[PDB]
Design a protein around this ligand. Structure first.
Ligand code: K
Ligand code: K
Lengths: 66, 66
């Protein structure tokens, strides 16, 4: 209710090295234009990424393990 | 550009104990309806709070120190 609302309005066009990534979360809220991934870098930078892209899915798999 | 956009659309009506708070950040973006505080709890819960309220300002001061 008093939770913040986070959405992604664009998706990155570059592959982020698995070396630069710390975590991610998914956006699934219907308040947003679409479903998204937000990667967080080892410098705590937040980048919107397309959940349908293979590199994005691979990086989340990597982070789920490594 | 591919940074996520976070806004607060409501503000909490209760004072959160300084004991339950871990951090906060400010929302200042013009993409949002107004300026906000998002407190994060010691359970990693995120709560929107009115920056103009004294208890909110006091809690940020506490977190800046303690
Ligand atoms: K794009
Ligand atoms: K309120």
């Amino acid at each position: 209710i008093n939770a913040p609302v986070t959405c992604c309005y664009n998706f990155t066009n570059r592959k982020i090295s698995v070396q630069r990534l710390a975590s991610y979360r998914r956006i699934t809220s219907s308040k947003c234009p679409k479903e998204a991934v937000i990667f967080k870098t080892i410098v705590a930078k937040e980048i919107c990424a397309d959940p349908k892209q293979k590199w994005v899915q691979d990086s989340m798999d990597h982070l789920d393990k490594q």
